Amino acid sequence: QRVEITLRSFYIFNSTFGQVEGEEHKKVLFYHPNDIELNTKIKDVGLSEAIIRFTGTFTSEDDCQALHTQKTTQLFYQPEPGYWLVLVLNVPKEVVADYRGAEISDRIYRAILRQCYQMFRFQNGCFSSCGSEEPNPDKRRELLCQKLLQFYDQHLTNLRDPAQCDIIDMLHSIQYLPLDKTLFLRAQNFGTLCETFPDIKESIMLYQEQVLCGGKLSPEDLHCVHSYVVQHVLKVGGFVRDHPMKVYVTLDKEAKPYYLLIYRALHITLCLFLNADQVAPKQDLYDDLHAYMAPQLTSLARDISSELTKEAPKYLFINEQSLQHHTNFLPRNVLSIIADLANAPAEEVQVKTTNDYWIVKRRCNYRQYYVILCNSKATLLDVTQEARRIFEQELTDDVFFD
């Protein structure tokens, strides 16, 4: 019998509140399994705070990262001064009850724990900004608790399976979309909507689940928009919808509120951003936009589909500046080794696993290249040319200078 990694608890706390005796239960802002008795809820926070206090003797309290134990593994994160997010896991077991906790990589789960906070901030803002109208400093926390419950009773349910995690989860990568010269320019021509309608501040396009035109937005904001649209529109021909949805992104100087509008034309999704200081738009804008955009988007999405329909070693190439990857994706140990090797001058690593697997890694110009050869026993001399053939077929230009 074998058991894989399973989630146990996820909680958020701040230790400043609850100083007065008899009200120590105010520090708990969110505990995931709600059926747990409050006494059991207090002790976890107590143990965590004890760990931060113990670490604070030598180094700073902000540097506490993880806690390892025979049966669990606890991970910490501090987004803002005072507030802490903690995630608790269960180690794999093989049956004498042997535990295999050494197979857990903390970086993947820390990245997941960061994605959680980023997804919260995208729609609601910082923890310290909620309820800014109330002057009473005690009633402000109730609104924060309500917002946390509403968001995290639906976010955690739709979480990805912990047993399956790879480099792509660590690195926030989206696949590349090959396309030709004319259709890309036709798609880019739709950014001229600003001149006709001066309210629009930005527009982005998606083809199915891949990016076609990103525009001005930063990669992290684009990833957030992609994740929301994938998990709330596609999986669940006109506008999808009275004040529209409000989101928080940064375009010029700082993060500001905006109204997000979503339009679907077959397999093309268009996201439009409007200002949030003024009044919500009326029906005339919707009617005009629909009557102006109905035929052209459908024609383009019908042409791209026709173009796409007409047209053992494994490889994975990743770009760090744009966060996009090209691959054709192996036992668990190989993937764990690739996770260990992932991360700056140039380098070159060749590694042979005990089960006859060759892994070749190179880095050059903010990019990473992985080639995996399997079921082949070859000496160290031949693997270089075997990798060079693959680096030649898939890369049009050679940047390694032979």
């Binding site: 143990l47 506490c64 134990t69 197979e103 080794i337």
Partner: protein, 420 residues
């Protein structure tokens, strides 16, 4: 003593604490344990709280410091490091300290002394032996840390006939003596000859304990010595009595005769006198002294000079616990780069021997080094080369080096240990 406001105390690169389950200080590497009393209370509180949930603390990871915990037999051990070492190596270090504690005091005596009465002060019994703990934990960062990382000792280079003559003298002069279980000859922290009794084998940990004891004491040259010593792996519930003495003034070789009977001082003294007379007559002290007077080996130095792109390497056969390593040279004379060399070796050793993800061959091309780590069914090899070398030359250099070692094996390595 506000230890939270002392930058010098917090800035050290290794801390080791040994305490009891009730919060009583026993051992601290830096600073008096009296003024560090709140910290031990905090440690005990953490350990007990986590243990009450039917689970045990293993480690703690922070931004720039790691902590490792251990608990056996009413004792708590904590190790804190700022270096590149992983948790398992710190656990091995803690096991070494525990083995030292059991070497000074028998396991049964400690178990009885805690079972009969708790809240006992163990400093009183562990008194006058701080040298054996300070010396053992000072092998950090001019190189015995390789011995600890690879868990293997170094052998004294000599022609095979001289070694056979020494072994023959020891066997012939020490045959009638009963209950004589080991006989060890050590010179300049290097093994020369070891004769054992059948059905008994020396374990690396005990052999390293003997080396540590011989290195720590300085009164062993003054006169003939008689002391008790406990070998944990051999027997955790008794003492073996040692007859310890140097060979002579001209040759600084230390001979240890370990026995189980208490009343054997004079017989072993006569055996020592006969042995040293026999070696003096057969021209064996001369070779030892000539080798000691030299600063470094000749043949190995010439072989390394013959390869102008090799800076350092480590070799260890799998069958036996022994090591071969050359002398440090100019590019790694300073400490600031010795630390980086140690970090490289630690990372390679961890990567090769990982249980979940075992590896078999590593080749890396970095900015300052070209590193190779090979693990086969007979040997292991860890080599460092210049950064602007080509790949097709490393292979031939490695091949010629291994071919030379395969023919000079008998001068640097001992295959089978002699028996009485």
């Amino acid at each position: 003593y506000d230890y939270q406001h002392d930058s010098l105390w917090q800035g050290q690169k290794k801390h080791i604490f040994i305490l009891s389950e009730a919060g009583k200080p026993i051992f601290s590497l830096h600073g008096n344990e009296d003024k560090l009393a709140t910290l031990f209370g905090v440690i005990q509180a953490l350990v007990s709280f986590v243990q009450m949930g039917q689970d045990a603390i293993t480690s703690i990871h922070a931004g720039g410091i790691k902590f490792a915990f251990m608990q056996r037999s009413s004792l708590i051990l904590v190790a804190a490091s700022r270096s590149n070492m992983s948790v398992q190596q710190l656990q091995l270090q803690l096991g070494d300290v525990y083995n030292q504690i059991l070497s000074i005091l028998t396991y049964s005596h400690m178990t009885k002394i805690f079972e009969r009465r708790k809240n006992f002060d163990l400093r009183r019994l562990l008194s006058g032996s701080e040298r054996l703990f300070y010396n053992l934990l000072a092998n950090d960062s001019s190189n015995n840390i390789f011995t600890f990382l690879t868990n293997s000792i170094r052998v004294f280079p000599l022609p095979t006939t001289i070694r056979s003559q020494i072994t023959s003298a020891i066997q012939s002069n020490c045959s009638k003596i009963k209950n004589l279980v080991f006989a060890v000859l050590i010179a300049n922290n290097k093994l020369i000859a070891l004769v054992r009794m059948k059905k008994y084998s020396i374990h690396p940990a005990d052999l390293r304990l003997i080396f540590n004891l011989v290195e720590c004491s300085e009164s062993f040259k003054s006169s003939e010595n008689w002391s008790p010593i406990c070998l944990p792996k051999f027997d955790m519930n008794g003492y073996l009595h040692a007859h310890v003495s140097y060979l002579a003034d001209d040759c600084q070789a230390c001979l240890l005769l370990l026995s189980v009977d208490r009343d054997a001082f004079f017989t072993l003294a006569e055996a020592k006198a006969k042995i040293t007379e026999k070696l003096r007559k057969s021209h064996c002290l001369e070779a030892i002294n000539e080798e000691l007077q030299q600063p470094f080996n000749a043949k190995l130095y010439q072989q390394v000079v013959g390869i102008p792109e090799l800076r350092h390497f480590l070799y260890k056969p799998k069958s036996t616990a022994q090591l071969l390593c050359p002398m440090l040279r100019h590019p790694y004379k300073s400490l600031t780069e010795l630390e980086r060399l140690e970090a490289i070796y630690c990372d390679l050793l961890h990567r090769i021997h990982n249980s979940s993800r075992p590896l078999k061959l590593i080749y890396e091309m970095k900015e300052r080094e070209v590193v190779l780590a090979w693990a086969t069914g007979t040997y292991e090899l860890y080599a460092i080369f210049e950064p602007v070398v080509d790949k097709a030359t490393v292979i031939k250099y490695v091949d010629k080096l291994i071919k030379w070692i395969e023919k000079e094996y008998d001068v640097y390595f001992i295959r089978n240990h002699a028996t009485f």
